[PDB]
Paper text:
The crystal structures of 3D alone and in complex, e.g., with RNA and the primer peptide 3B (also known as VPg) have shed light on the mechanism of RNA polymerization. In summary, we have identified novel cis and trans functions of the FMDV 3D RNA-dependent RNA polymerase that are essential for viral RNA replication.
These maps also indicated the presence of the duplex portion of the template-primer in the central cavity of the enzyme and the AU nucleotides, belonging to the template 5′ overhang region, bound to the template channel. Structural comparisons showed that the 3D-[name]/[name] mutant polymerase is almost identical to the wild-type 3D. Structural comparisons also showed a subtle movement of the loop containing the mutated residues [name]/[name], which was displaced by ∼0.74 Å toward the [name]. However, this small displacement does not alter the 3D-RNA interactions at the dsRNA exit site. The main differences lie in the template entry channel, in particular in the M16-R17 segment, located distal from the mutated region. In contrast, in the [name]/[name] structure, the main and side chains of residues M16 and R17 appeared reoriented, with the R17 side chain pointing to the polymerase interior, interacting with residues N41 and Y285.
Residue numbers in the entry: 1 to 476
Amino acid sequence: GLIVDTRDVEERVHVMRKTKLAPTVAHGVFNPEFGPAALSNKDPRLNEGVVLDEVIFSKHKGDTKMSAEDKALFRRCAADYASRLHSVLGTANAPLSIYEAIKGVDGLDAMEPDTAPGLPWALQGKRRGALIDFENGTVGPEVEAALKLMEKREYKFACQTFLKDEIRPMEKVRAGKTRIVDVLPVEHILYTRMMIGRFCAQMHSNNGPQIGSAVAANPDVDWQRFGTHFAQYRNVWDVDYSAFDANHCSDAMNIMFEEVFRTEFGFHPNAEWILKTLVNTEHAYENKRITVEGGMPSGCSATSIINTILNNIYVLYALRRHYEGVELDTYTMISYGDDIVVASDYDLDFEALKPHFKSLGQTITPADKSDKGFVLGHSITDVTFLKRHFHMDYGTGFYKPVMASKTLEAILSFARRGTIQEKLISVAGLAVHSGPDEYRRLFEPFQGLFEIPSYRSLYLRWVNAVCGDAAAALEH
RNA sequence: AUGGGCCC
RNA sequence: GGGCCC
Ligand SMILES: [Mg+2]
């Protein structure tokens, strides 16, 4: 988006500047060029002459403004994709009762009780359980007024900025581009789920190529489904965006809300309204207070679904701007926020589509950086989705999600205080698809110290998950 | 460190 | 309550 006023207020918000990630026994062996993100502005590992506040907000390179013809095309693409969307899901997108938004429904999980509450609650020294009691599922006095203050449409707020204590490649760590988190107020998350929660739950359960969404998908079972679909098309593309969320232009966000969440399809009038509050946000970061126009806050309700919807609309908009006679039938795709896979039997020139994406403020790039161009003839066994490759299991011929060994080495090389044993359990379910030799090698530093599940136990569990008949048939 | 997922 | 993905 576009930063419009950086302000210095007397009050200051504290930011976590101490990594909980510590090296493990595996770090000494694997020597990964990965490390914890720089949280302090006086971090020794930073390259000299790098201010952390400067690098963080560098993702806002302006807010692209569209012409009326570009907006009328985007409005048609939003209306066409919304027609397909609400035709698969149905139009049962009525509001949600107050405690349905808290305890969830079929497809939508419950809210997290012990996560940061946002502003202005955090500035009092307040946990989230004080405002909303989650055991019963009711709100307290502060949220009482805000809920109906949102109904009045008077509700103003601000996003609390947070540093993401995660593992990053050492080039990004020394460059100081630590990723941030825009924490919205808890009452805003509650009210958003009331307006569009039933829509989100219906998307979760209906994920797949038909709606172009992979949100709420389980790669262990869903990759035989996705893999066989994209293996049916001549050309496959692995497109990468740069700052996909920050570069959503105001016009594209506003037009998408006006077309997807219409009261025609069953939503409440405030569904369009509450989503439009995300366009022009105020952000608090210690002394600073930053007003921004455009971009999506990375930390709000339905932020993955909104990004997934925009991603689907961007492809339809770009193709129609360059070619003639293009519909949703022309191509197939599936996305999970910025991550996207596209395919078509037509010979689509994606190099030619780069400027048409640039009119939306987005910059597309081939994930396979070699040659530095979108070539044709790639298959599903070339591309990556959700940090996993589509490889066919040699034993049962099913597609399985395989992660690169150096990605698993980075994951295994760091861990928080005493969370190692169950992290080894969780990661082993990911490492099983790298094969028996690679699985034993990834956990060799740990054996004799921790419990390591057998490759046999995890492979059998996966066979039953992808298809319980596959386990039974192998028995007869 | 958030929103939402998926596994335990 | 922990891990992983976006
Ligand atoms: Mg990608």
